[PDB]
From a paper:
Three capsid types have been recognized from the nuclei of herpesvirus-infected cells: empty A-capsids, scaffolding-containing B-capsids, and DNA-filled C-capsids. Here, portal proteins assemble into a dodecameric basket-like structure that is thought to seed the assembly of scaffolding proteins, in turn driving the formation of spherical procapsids composed of MCP, SCP, and triplexes. A separate protein complex, the terminase, associates with the dodecameric portal and initiates genome packaging and the concurrent autoproteolytic cleavage of the scaffold.
C-capsid portal baskets are positioned higher at the portal vertex compared to their A- and B-capsid counterparts, which has been attributed to the densely packed genome pushing the portal up against the capsid shell. These observations together suggest that genome pressure alone does not determine portal basket height, and the elevated portal position observed in C- and D-capsids may instead be an irreversible step during capsid maturation. C-capsid portals did not vary in height but were still capable of 9 degree rotations and ~1 nm of portal basket sway. These findings reveal distinct patterns of portal basket variability, with A- and B-capsids exhibiting greater positional and rotational flexibility compared to the more constrained movement observed in C- and D-capsids. The C12 reconstruction of both A- and B-capsid portal baskets revealed a small hook-like density with large aromatic side chains and sharp turns wedged into a hydrophobic pocket between the crown domains of each portal monomer. This density is weaker in A-capsids, but still conspicuous, whereas it is completely absent in C-capsids, D-capsids, and mature virions.
Numbering used by the authors:
A (entry chain d), B (entry chain c): 24 to 27, 29 to 308, 494 to 623
C (entry chain a): 227 to 301
Write the structure that this text describes.
Amino acid sequence: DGWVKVHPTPGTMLFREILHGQLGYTEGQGVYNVVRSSEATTRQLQAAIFHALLNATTYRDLEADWLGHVAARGLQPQRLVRRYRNAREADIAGVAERVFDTWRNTLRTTLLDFAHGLVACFAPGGPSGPSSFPKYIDWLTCLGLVPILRKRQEGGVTQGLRAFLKQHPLTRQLATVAEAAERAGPGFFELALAFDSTRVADYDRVYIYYNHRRGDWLVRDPISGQRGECLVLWPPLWTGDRLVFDSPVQRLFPEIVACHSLREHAHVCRLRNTASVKVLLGRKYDIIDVSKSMDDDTYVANSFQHPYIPSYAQDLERLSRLWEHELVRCFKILCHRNNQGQETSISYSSGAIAAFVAPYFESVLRAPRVGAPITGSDVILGEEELWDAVFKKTRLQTYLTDIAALFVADVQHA
Amino acid sequence: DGWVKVHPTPGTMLFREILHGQLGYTEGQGVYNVVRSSEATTRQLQAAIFHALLNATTYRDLEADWLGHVAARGLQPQRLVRRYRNAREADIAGVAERVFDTWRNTLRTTLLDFAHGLVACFAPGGPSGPSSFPKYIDWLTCLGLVPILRKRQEGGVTQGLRAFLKQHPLTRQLATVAEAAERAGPGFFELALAFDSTRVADYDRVYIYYNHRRGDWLVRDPISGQRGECLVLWPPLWTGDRLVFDSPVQRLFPEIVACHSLREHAHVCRLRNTASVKVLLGRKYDIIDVSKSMDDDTYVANSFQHPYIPSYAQDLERLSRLWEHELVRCFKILCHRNNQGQETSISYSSGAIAAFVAPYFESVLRAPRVGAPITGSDVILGEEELWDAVFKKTRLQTYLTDIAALFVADVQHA
Amino acid sequence: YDRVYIYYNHRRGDWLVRDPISGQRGECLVLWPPLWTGDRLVFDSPVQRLFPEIVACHSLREHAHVCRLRNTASV
């Protein structure tokens, strides 16, 4: 009733084949490899987890832990001052600030270890398997659509979380991390459930049907008999006779076809010209041409030779430049070049992550709030740098300084 | 029932051949050699072992050892101050600082020697043989798969560890070293067991089967009859007739074939052209072309000479550049180049380790914990620099400074 | 180099090195392993990689010399 088949057509198969370089290849196309990188997704995962865990810190809990450690070490400031029998403010101030600094950086290391354990638990299920990011990105590149199949289930990620959190010894030693983990735990459980639920359709096993009268989609798995959903970022066009996509491969398609045809014709012409001497036969290493087959009351009046051979270097170079420029502009990639003109590194710009990573989470993953998205510089840096940067600004440092200021000032003012 | 062979087909054998330069070779392909480097894995082992050793330190045990050394040297602050008979606190402060600093660097030398022995114990078995890193890399490059055969058994690595730890007299001298080694012992045994258990399949024997109807793999050893696991990083695609892999060699395949065919055609055309003078005969150093063989009731009309010779400089240069660019972008390698654009060294970037080294440990080797991944700068630096860097920021330095300041206060008030 | 004898087996994958004259049995160590492709063996040494190009270059030089010698005549 107005429906038409879309995906199993050979056109999309040819698109995917040209993505793998089945015909033609240029170094400009090589920039596509960084477009499939999962660095941004992992950065977003760890930043969101860091924000979630650290915002659960309690001022009272950390004050209780600090006073418990103080009692355990017996470092009562009045007792230390009386034992030292001096009014040297600088000495006791240095001692107190150093002790608080050692407590703060041991807390930092413990929190870093626990967060690293959590993010390592979450890491494997992101890139490979369910919600595979490269599959989403090459779906958007090939056609501009992201088919999805949803099903509520318990997955291996939840099993890993369960096998991780309970037996972790850090809950027994540090109380504050225990309360922080337990109060936010259902959020991580829901995140794991969302990870399991979302499955991205495999390219060669999914069928897409579109109806043009009303403009609605239908996606189903021929083998599993499961109905899914269709998500579109930039919609296609329906001319009435053929559905015309608007993906970058669609735009690039005619030029690659022309270049490949030219290269094939050049090869065919080159193969013919292997001969050295040619002759002709007519009525009154070597190749003989015989016109006697078609001689019928005829006679040769003249003959000509023109050994053409096509050239294709500039066309390949232009195709490489076009590939590079299109892939740079479409995905808003960021390029770094030095004074002499040498390329140094390729990284995602802030626009790229804001335009692709965030909608991925909000629609393909259906994940809850992810907090403030990272900046373009953060993805370049390392995990420890991101951890320190987020730790400095956020809530925990304010409580830490709040404790430190009064704890220090009390002993010297006394 | 839907199964089909994957590896024994001549395509993968041709891929492995083309890596070894069986056909064609260019300067760009040479950058593959630095990819197979084992420096990153060894640096990761060093960092992991250093972290696993240092965290086992005990503040009480370190204090006990320091006070025992002080008592052995008779460095009682009260007695030494009474002997000096002067009010110069600077002298006693400097003496205490120097003595504790020599204790510091003696502890550091002992720790680094023991750690170097331990890492040397794990050094040979890791990157080569069982769980050999270059085989993992060239499996990823050839196909995108990493066949694995697993078996739980004791290995020579554990034998070396056993020959090391209890035969090391360092435990009898320093209490802290013995206590830390005893605490961290089981983890190293688990690491050795993980090293021995994992075996990477060899290219010439193992067989892998695929089935698209349900998307499953089957890997087995034809001779030993052992069944294993099939790991995939970037999956392939099934287009009915064939299975187009998504490895870099697969992308590069058509261009190399075209270049090699052109070189062969150029050679065969060049060999023919060695003649200087050529003549032809017909019915009424030297080469004679007898057209009389087919000259029957036929008569010549004209003759031609077009001595073509193909050239291949441009294709070779482009292939070299394409090889270099593809290998640089695919594995996220990093280059260092100076003012005039000439390179000086090749390094293993942070993205490279984060995308290859870590999943290798987590899946191929099934390591329990690797700690915080190193930065891209650490692989450049030497072992001693890495040890010194990891020593400074960690718990043992905190304990060391805590002891130092309290001892300085005690000696200055004494 | 010119004395030692090296034997290899493909089904089990083991080596055997012995001195033909002294009769002494030794030990075989490998850094990067070779490859077994049926009725052939392919090493992975740098010279092995460089081999297919040097042969072509030497053949080209030989053919150039052969052609040069012929053209010494004037008429």
